[PDB]
Design a protein around this ligand. Structure first.
Ligand SMILES: [Pr+3]
Ligand SMILES: [Pr+3]
Ligand SMILES: [Pr+3]
Lengths: 224, 225
């Protein structure tokens, strides 16, 4: 079975019917690949399980020891949920043509020729490339994700939060996935800080969620 | 000098005034960098002297990093060249960041998309072999085997054929072994290139558009496989 130990999530399509999701999901399943309908989040522990307000960066979930390859499929680059998560996790976003090429070769070929742009940077006004650590035939996804420290690793972020609340949680989730620790508060309260995030309600300094996306698209700490 | 061991080519801007090229060219020179006005070709021999793939010139032993700078991806000849050689095409901000840090930083956060695939109908990523600080550009370029390494390609091509030569060059940079004859039809081969002439009737290998070369450049792969 070609897709043995591979996890797939499917994003978009961005443009109507640029690819047949259901057909491809079926082909993947029929070949030993697991399909995650909601996306890559099940690879990690739910940070919001405790409904806590001071959060540590994400840790790989037990179940991800069971796989060694992951991919998000997309007709082109986007800012949809599954896409950003993948960017956050350093999991390759690839063109559907990858799956078809795997079938054609009766194996899992190198995904690079099908590796989409990471996204469009408004700050830089260009499309950037994804930068993917190669899959090691030695590690499970659990090893890979455990050993990964994202571009925001170490950084301590204060997210100030007095429908819209879920939007905030998503930004927090991305910051955690990039390796930052995040404390959710209503005020700075004179707290020590590396960086402060608001949806836009005094010594860090401050920045909005677009900053997070730039970090996601560029896989860097752009405040640098 | 920060850029003492870096070679830079500059392309575009692609969009009017996206960046101040002359200002950037000046600052790189002021900071020790070599600027190649015509692009990256001077780093290799002149193959058009049925020659085999490109070899780096001894000159390139004197530098260990190279970049093509551009506001965004394009199909300009300098860009296409960088793609063929696996030299990073980066955003101008890269230079400003180096100045800011007083060192040559990781170019990675400034790594532009490789290009738009009309075949896949999407924008793809560049994939660059990391610069090993112990290796010169010569070592780097000598060790490289493009995605077209091995492929025998026939360029039937009987001022304007300069645009043609550009394609020939990219195939070689991609590591192909190329022979150029006005027409076939014996002959060897595993691929045939014609710039929309038509190509003779019967043939032993599929006919290909230059776009096929561009697709190989943008995806860094052998596409007909
Ligand atoms: Pr030196
Ligand atoms: Pr102009
Ligand atoms: Pr102008």
């Amino acid at each position: 079975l070609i897709f043995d130990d591979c996890v797939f999530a499917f994003s978009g399509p961005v443009h109507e019917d640029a690819y047949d999701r259901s057909a491809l999901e079926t082909v993947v399943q029929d070949h030993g690949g697991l399909v995650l309908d909601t996306g890559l989040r099940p690879l990690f522990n739910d940070p919001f399980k405790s409904k806590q307000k001071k959060l540590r960066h994400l840790k790989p979930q037990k179940r991800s020891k069971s796989w060694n390859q992951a991919f998000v499929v997309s007709d082109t680059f986007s800012r949809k949920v599954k896409y950003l998560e993948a960017l956050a996790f350093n999991i390759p976003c690839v063109h559907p043509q990858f799956i078809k090429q795997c079938l054609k070769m009766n194996r899992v070929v190198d995904f690079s020729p099908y590796l989409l742009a990471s996204g469009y940077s408004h700050r830089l006004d260009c499309t950037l490339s994804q930068r993917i650590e190669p899959f090691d035939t030695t590690d499970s996804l659990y090893d890979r994700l455990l050993a990964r420290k994202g571009p925001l690793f170490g950084k301590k972020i204060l997210f100030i939060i007095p429908e819209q609340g879920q939007k905030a949680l998503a930004h927090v989730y991305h910051a955690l996935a990039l390796g930052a620790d995040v404390e959710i508060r209503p005020n700075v309260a004179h707290l020590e800080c590396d960086l402060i995030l608001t949806m836009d309600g005094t010594n860090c300094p401050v920045v909005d969620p677009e900053w997070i996306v730039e970090c996601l698209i560029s896989q860097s700490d752009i405040s640098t």
